[PDB]
Amino acid sequence: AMFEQMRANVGKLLKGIDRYNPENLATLERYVETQAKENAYDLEANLAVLKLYQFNPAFFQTTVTAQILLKALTNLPHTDFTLCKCMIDQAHQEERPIRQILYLGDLLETCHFQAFWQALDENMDLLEGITGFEDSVRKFICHVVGITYQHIDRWLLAEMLGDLTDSQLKMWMSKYGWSADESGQIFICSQEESIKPKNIVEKIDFDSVSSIMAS
């Protein structure tokens, strides 16, 4: 619970002149790991460390940027991960573990979820070391499933989530209330509920137009 004990402090740090002072990296780089480990997030603290790393490339630290990058990818499809590459130098995108983390990140944006879980190397203990990261990406998979599927097959939804078993899939089935259908797909959304058109309907703007044309 060190996240909660730094929120007030780091909040006033990042609104002052201490976000272009490199000396504050002590409390800030610590607070970046506090996001990753304790499963919390703060974009501004990340982005300020990224900005201070962009200022002096020497102070760049690989794991601290991985703790930024990995937790940026949990928060998709937001432009958190967009802002990461914007501050990470040409030199610094070819580091370890950065290069592998960035490549894995590319797969999530283009939504190649099958390729994402294939691409994983399982000997990098840092990717095991981020708490709730393995489920977070799965929750973002299922998040975009709801937006752009009306149904999905049982084998298909398994494979996207890293080739899940029958019992492992029970969590993800129950999560958004999804349930089986006849022969034999998993329901995701109603057909009229997914589409949501807001197309042709206007020319009802009479009231304003007559209020201005009143005199």
Place this chain on the structure above:
Amino acid sequence: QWLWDIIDEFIYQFQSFSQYRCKTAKKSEEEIDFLRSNPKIWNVHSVLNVLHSLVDKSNINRQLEVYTSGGDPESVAGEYGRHSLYKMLGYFSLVGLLRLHSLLGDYYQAIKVLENIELNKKSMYSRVPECQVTTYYYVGFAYLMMRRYQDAIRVFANILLYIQRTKSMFQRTTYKYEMINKQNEQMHALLAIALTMYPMRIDESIHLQLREKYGDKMLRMQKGDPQVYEELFSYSCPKFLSPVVPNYDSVHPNYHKEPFLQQLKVFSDEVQQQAQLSTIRSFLKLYTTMPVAKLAGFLDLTEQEFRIQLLVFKHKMKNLVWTSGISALDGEFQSASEVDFYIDKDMIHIADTKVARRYGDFFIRQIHKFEE
């Protein structure tokens, strides 16, 4: 030497005035009150704020893009130059918004953007068109960065229209009049590539002199040539960042192209796969719910054998640009074809046309004043 005789004498005069800015605004009522009285124009007082927005940014961009190590420029300005002026109590006039939108400009070139939230919240004073067009300038760019293509494209339309009832007249966009034309032109051109089978709002925004050339650009870009990836990205870069002055081009100093590696290659990643999203949508969605005849007709069109047609098809529906469903028993692909709207231009014009009547009726009644 004449170069840095001019540059250094700007900054040293601004660092001088920065103390006067902080000193007058906060506490000395009588000094402010004395300044309200004497001239016939308070325009001299206010111009000097956002005059030094773009001139200081030029001078600091030079010092930034000449000294790439042991950074003197960026932490001096960031700490002292910017935050001292803005963070403390505003001067009582439009100067509070001027120093705000000077700071918003300074904050824009730096790629650290997330306090666009609170800058809008501290724009308490009324949105004069002067301040409003320059707000929508950056706020649209912020939406362009947010991947809110549909939102940002509307925001660029109004500011390029030239019936936001601008009149200027006395040099409040001076020496960069056509930058507002060409940057809004350029940044709108990128957004059209991403989404468009919706607007049907591009008629208002950009005139037919440019719609014709930018129209064929998007088609030539997404369909058949990666040539437009080059020429679009050439023009897009000076306008995306806004680096006010590129330094003297010579090989004897290096010093300049090293910052431009980052600055440019930062925007490479933007247009890279966001463009390749376009070609998927480019093929018109001919039959709304596709049977075997049309689904295979589109999977012949996506990619050929064998390996991995279906996978790539179902990767790309996810992104934002399709809403659809798969059926198992039927083997059927059902999808969503959405369209925009025809005429939204007329009812927005009904006031704009009346301004052509109004300032018509008014300007000649200013001539009817004089020659009477």
